[model samples]
Target: RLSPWEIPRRDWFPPSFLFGAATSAYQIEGAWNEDGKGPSTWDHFCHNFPEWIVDRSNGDVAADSYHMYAEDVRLLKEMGMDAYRFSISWPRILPKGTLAGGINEKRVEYYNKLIDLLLENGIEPYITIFHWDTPQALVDAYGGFLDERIIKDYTDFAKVCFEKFGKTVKNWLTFNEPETFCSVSYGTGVLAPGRCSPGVSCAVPTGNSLSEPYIVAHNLLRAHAETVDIYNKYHKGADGRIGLALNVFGRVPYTNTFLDQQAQERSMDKCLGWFLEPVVRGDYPFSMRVSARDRVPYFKEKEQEKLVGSYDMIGINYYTSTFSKHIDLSPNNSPVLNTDDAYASQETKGPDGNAIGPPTGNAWINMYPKGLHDILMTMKNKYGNPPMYITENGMGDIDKGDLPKPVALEDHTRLDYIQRHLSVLKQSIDLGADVRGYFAWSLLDNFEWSSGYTERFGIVYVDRENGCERTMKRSARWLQEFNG
Candidate 1:
């Protein structure tokens, strides 16, 4: 087993490797709807639709993390972690989205306790002001982000976080995969406040879901820029940094065919550049801008000022990569929002290529190590030189089994995944990517959004019964030694 502090050669790693792990409040903290905590959009969504979750699972009692955080912090200290990346539940802080207005002193005080605890343990608190969990009241009142009114309210809520916790919460992630929250929630309605409108239906190509990502990203960029400006101006010299965490994947076209290559480029632009372009280039990619069906948001005068120079660094959350291909379609029958418009595709088939997905267990990711190296270089050349952090990365496996068998605990597959990716990340740093830290996607398995409790992505396994049993996995040991 690799020790966290020594296995990875603490000397070879940058002093700022920031050895740590990541988790969120709602995913682990049960006691849902408990103690004056108003329901977030998640609480409302999960309760209304049991079928939406594969296991009919909700996060009401995930890991009971809210109560068990002391134990969790002890583990972080044991790992010799420098920081812990976590999020504040909007409802937990604001109770609702507004101030009296969502603001709750008890909620604010709870975070102070947690933040101070991390400091006491010599671990810095890397805070994300908003995860996906929106206050249910905001969705009901202003239709959430869909309504432009959200722009100001979100900044207001962020203000509460900075004023309340900014003194100690040195690392601030304004939004957690804010683009994913926008597109996934709006177009697919797969996540929360689920609403797929007529406009979404008319725009999707046969192969694509509603293209809700770009428009949502447009608003999100502005929101992030606004928050960055707020902090840059008011909280200058506060010894903190603020940025958004974006998800990236190392991808391949599946085959060398002409069509396949085109598909690969398109996927890169859509998946990676969709959020990257506005922040780095200060505008949406013209290709995406022209293809959008409705009037997507564009930056405002002051908003551009807020956005263009605000990013302190790029926060990257990478997982797996998928192969791409061109789906030929006319505007009339085209997928509402598809990658075809962005790039061409090649014709090559995976051994298990089939409709819905190719015949592979991990269809979303092709297990391509080279893809990671290429992505790092891509970010380097395209975006100039910005410091980067591997904000979140990890793989998943089963946590519980039924009468047939118990869930596997010795997960070597995930270990291989982390090893290969970290090796690639090391190479990126060697090649001068200004890379800083790597935060494993999770600390323990709680309620995975759609897959529910069916999929596990924790270093510590959670049983979800008997108050959720947590057993450290094989990879956790690897991380312990590797980081050591």
Candidate 2:
């Protein structure tokens, strides 16, 4: 393992640069089903559904950071970070995502104590009300967000979080990614609950028909907006800000060709713009709603009002870019649009039918760092310049070295990666993007979602085979000085 290099004071970057790291409960916290903690969706998915995950790996004892929260905080303090962004496990705190028998007051107090510790160390806690770890109880109750009934239950959970921790916690992320939750896990069957099979329909009311994802997304948007409304009405202190965290990416047309540009832009409009327009402008973008070949899932006026103007900020989690093309529905060559139970990506290969990356990044995220800059730029132009927070961004590589390879800590590639993106980020800031702070994808390597423990993206490399000990990687130091 190597460390990131630090530049001299004179050559260092801006004063507002946020040098922080990100983390989640299930990924790093290893004590699965312990301390009266009920099973989260991740826990049940990994433990019960053996054939769901492609990697077939479990995060039962991920990084063991749950018991070592102090040590984790120690690393953040050592890094000279401005903040520490983490998620509150719905199941961990409130095993069920409800108020009746969901929240254990004692566990809620435990998080209160943790928040005090972060404040005690002067490390700002950027909290996410719900990461992808939706309570298993909620999923079983109303089939999670698939059913519309889940909205009230979800808002109730959000209200409880706001009521209890809202006084101390200021930043609230209503959702991690509803699209991923509904589409990736349910629609594509790649993450958890993995029910949206090409052949097998979901067990919920809305059959695993062509419009299933839209139904799920419709419910998800309503739920997010309702949470925002709950926070605004209840947490009247004006102390905290609430927003939705989008795993957004910079998108680029495949080529200068007119068709390629349309392809790329159309993809963005459908995936992200739809959600953004509704949240920021109170209505889905007209162009976006029509661009998709699939019957886009939209909300009624009453539901729309419940969602519009419901956010204080946009949690932009950008990393890479994508190259796409426009393929209309026409027989075999046409891209399928909600004609089947399961939905999929038609432009798997960019123009010329080539893979998206230039031979880098993780399997799914393989775009260049420059894409990050373009993404921020696009967000500025499309949506008004809102305070954009870098919720997650990092490099992923397979680390396979015996006797623990020497900690070099140079990681110039990542430095180049960060520099390329940050340079553009600064330009966007200068151009008035209101880009406030950045939190790297992670402080330590834990679980890489469905990829399991294969891809390492941490500034601190944890020897998972051991007691989850750490070795500072080269990229870690680079980020420290970059922010400094």
Against the hidden reference, what TM-scores do the models get? 0.89, 0.88
51: Cα error in model 2, Å: 3.9
lDDT of 2 by residue, 155-216 (tens): 88778788888887888888876656656666656666665645543322224534556677
Off by over 4 Å in 1: 1-8, 197-212, 254-260, 293-295, 328-333, 338-366, 403-407
How many pairs of residues collide in each model?
Answer: 30, 12
- Tens-digit per-residue lDDT, 1-484, candidate 1: 3355423456667776786789987788887777678788888888987777778889898888777788788777776778899988888777777776657777777788888899999998888888888888887897676666777878888988889888777788888876567656765666775555555532222222444455556767777888988888776464778887887765576677886676677667766777777777677666566655454567887777667757787888877566676565465544543433454443334535633222212325335555667888988877886878888887667544541113446767677677767777888889988888888878887788877876677877766656676667777777777667
Q: What is the lDDT of residue 475 in candidate 2?
A: 74
Find the 10 residues in a row with the least total lDDT in model 1: 354-363
